[PDB]
């Protein structure tokens, strides 16, 4: 799988492939790996789908309870810390690589990466999954400070397309989410909508 | 995969006499083929009349000396007296055997004066079997050290020689010489040599350099 997030001024953008493989077999070719933990907070799931869904639902539960208790919107650092505590307590049991993303008033758009092992780091852009390997170079090269929402969306789409082409485990369609003060606008790119990079020919 | 044990080296010696007990050790600490430090004495003072040396896994050594100091304090608080060397030894045997199925990989030596005033040396296995001896060596170079002491101190395999009782000066010179030789032909020992002698007056500590690796 391939997941990707990037922070823009006033929000974040999330991107992920739509393929889950059991071995060399694609059980679901249209799965949604973007899970909303809350109205303005999202999660991108890599690794064991079971583990990720379980921790996602549990964190959603804990965070909704915390938010309704406080009567204030939750913080992305808080959500990521919950994920971190869970994945570190159960680091031996579950294999899960998470990248949490959302917006809050006080800190704005935030992206946190909770890889396997239960560590947590804020990142301007972060990628995960089997396919992330194949695009580390592309993101290290073409990233720019101060990108816009449209620019970050195109960046994410290009990266996920490259990873989808090269990696077998990632493919299908690209799911995108842009989170900001107003809300979340989700869009799905299929067919020609995916950026196409020409394969070499002799 | 995870190995909870590692051999941190170390060598320890203990000698007893009519009115003295000598305990000595190297100061080098080394994991693998790398030195960690050149000043880490293996010999700790438990009380006025007792010195303990520990060799092997340094973490177990640390926890053990900690536990012993704690239980000495507890004994004093309860019974209104300081522990004797044999009591320390028996308690240590129980402690070591408590974790038989996940042992302390540590070879210990107790050195002290008994209630009668004589020198005493108790030598422990890692699992808690303890035996009183007049002299004992422990650690990496115990095999190197024990034969010479059996020959000189014990007068074994020596024909028509006077079974003279050992004296302080001869004992000190002897331990210096044997640790010199063990530094010559053992890699784990060699940084320095701390000689912690216990006597009626108290404990004196002397130090002599050995050849660095």
């Amino acid at each position: 799988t391939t997941i990707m997030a990037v922070q823009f001024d006033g929000g974040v953008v999330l991107g992920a492939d739509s393929r889950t493989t059991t071995g060399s077999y694609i059980a679901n070719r249209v799965t949604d790996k973007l899970t909303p933990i809350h109205d303005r907070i999202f999660c991108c799931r890599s690794g064991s789908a079971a583990d990720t869904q379980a921790v996602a639902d549990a964190v959603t539960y804990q965070l909704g309870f915390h938010s309704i208790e406080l009567n204030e919107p939750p913080l992305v650092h808080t959500a990521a810390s919950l994920f971190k505590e869970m994945c570190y307590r159960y680091r031996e049991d579950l294999m899960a690589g998470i990248i949490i993303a959302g917006w809050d008033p006080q800190e704005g758009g935030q992206v946190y990466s909770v890889p396997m092992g239960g560590m947590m780091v804020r990142q301007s852009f972060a990628i995960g999954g089997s396919g992330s390997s194949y695009i580390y170079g592309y993101v290290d090269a073409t990233y720019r400070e101060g990108m816009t929402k449209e620019e970050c969306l195109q960046f994410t789409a290009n990266a996920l397309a490259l990873a989808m082409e090269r990696d077998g485990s990632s493919g299908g369609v690209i799911r995108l989410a842009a989170i900001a003060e107003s809300g979340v606008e989700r869009q799905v790119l299929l067919g020609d909508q995916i950026p196409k990079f020409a394969v070499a020919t002799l | 995969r995870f190995s909870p044990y590692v051999f941190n080296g170390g060598t320890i010696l203990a000698i007893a006499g009519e009115d003295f007990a000598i305990v000595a050790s190297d100061t080098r600490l080394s994991e693998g083929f790398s030195i960690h430090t050149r000043d880490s004495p293996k010999c700790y003072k438990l009380t006025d009349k007792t010195v303990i040396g520990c060799s092997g896994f340094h973490g177990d050594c640390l926890t053990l000396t900690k536990i012993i100091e704690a239980r000495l304090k507890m004994y004093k608080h309860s019974n209104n007296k300081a522990m004797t060397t044999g009591a320390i030894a028996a308690m240590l045997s129980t402690i070591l055997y408590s974790r038989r199925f996940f042992p302390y990989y540590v070879y210990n030596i107790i050195g002290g004066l008994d209630e009668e005033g004589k020198g005493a040396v108790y030598s422990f296995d890692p699992v808690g079997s303890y035996q009183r001896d007049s002299f004992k060596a422990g650690g990496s170079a115990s095999a190197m050290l024990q034969p010479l002491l059996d020959n000189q101190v014990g007068f074994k395999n020596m024909q028509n020689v006077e079974h003279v009782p050992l004296s302080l000066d001869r004992a000190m010179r002897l331990v210096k010489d044997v640790f010199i030789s063990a530094a010559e032909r053992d890699v784990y020992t060699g940084d320095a040599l701390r000689i912690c002698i216990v006597t009626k007056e108290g404990i004196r500590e002397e130090t002599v350099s050995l050849r660095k690796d």
Partner: protein, 235 residues
């Protein structure tokens, strides 16, 4: 009465329960101990209920260890539990430290059981009342001959000579009149038996008493009938 629980303080602060236990011991049989350089002596009155009772069955003096023996007065059933723990404590001490537990340590350990009685959250199985018994631990150690009196309050204290039981007051007055540190074990035994003769309702004979002594050389030794007969004939 059930109006007040076990754990409560009088306005004076005396803790009704242990106070009641202390006055209950005054029902108990008399017992005397004396401390000397030669050794420590313990003596009691067996208080035979009827002649049919075998006197040898009554064991008011017991052996916690070779070097320690205690006498008891009051509820003997509680004393049984206390001496049980004292025994296992001495033997655990030997197991661990390869040496003899001293009298202060032993009576300190057994005294820790007292005042542990509690009803709310004490334990799955625990005492609901104080141990209504007084003890006279006596023995010899590195320090020397020693004697200790352990009340239900838990207050262990050293004492050169002490009398517990019903006639404690008069016995202690007589002991204060008699005692001197220079006294020997024979004179101490004689004085103890004389005082028991004074206080005991029945005429004193070898059957109705139990006597024991601990000296530095020997262990806990309980005087047999022949020895007791010799001593009382002397007295």
């Amino acid at each position: 009465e059930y109006d007040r629980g076990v754990n409560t303080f009088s306005p004076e602060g005396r803790l009704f329960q242990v106070e009641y236990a202390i006055e209950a011991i005054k029902l108990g049989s008399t017992a005397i101990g004396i401390q000397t350089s030669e050794g420590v002596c313990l003596a009691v009155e067996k208080r035979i209920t009827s002649p049919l009772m075998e006197p040898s069955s009554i064991e008011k003096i017991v052996e916690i260890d070779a070097h320690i023996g205690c006498a008891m007065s009051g509820l003997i059933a509680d004393a049984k539990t206390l001496i049980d723990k004292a025994r296992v404590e001495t033997q655990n001490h030997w197991f661990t430290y390869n040496e003899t537990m001293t009298v202060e340590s032993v009576t300190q350990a057994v005294s820790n059981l007292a005042l542990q009685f509690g009803e709310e959250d004490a334990d799955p199985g625990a005492m609901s009342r104080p141990f209504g018994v007084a003890l006279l631990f006596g023995g010899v150690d590195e320090k020397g001959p020693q004697l200790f009196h352990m009340d239900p309050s838990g207050t262990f204290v050293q004492c050169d000579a002490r009398a517990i039981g019903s006639a404690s007051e008069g016995a202690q007055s007589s002991l204060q009149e008699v005692y001197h540190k220079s006294m020997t074990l024979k004179e101490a035994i004689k004085s103890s038996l004389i005082i028991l003769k004074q206080v005991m309702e029945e005429k004193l004979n070898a059957t109705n008493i139990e006597l024991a002594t601990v000296q530095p050389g020997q262990n806990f030794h309980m005087f047999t009938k022949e020895e007791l007969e010799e001593v009382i004939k002397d007295i």
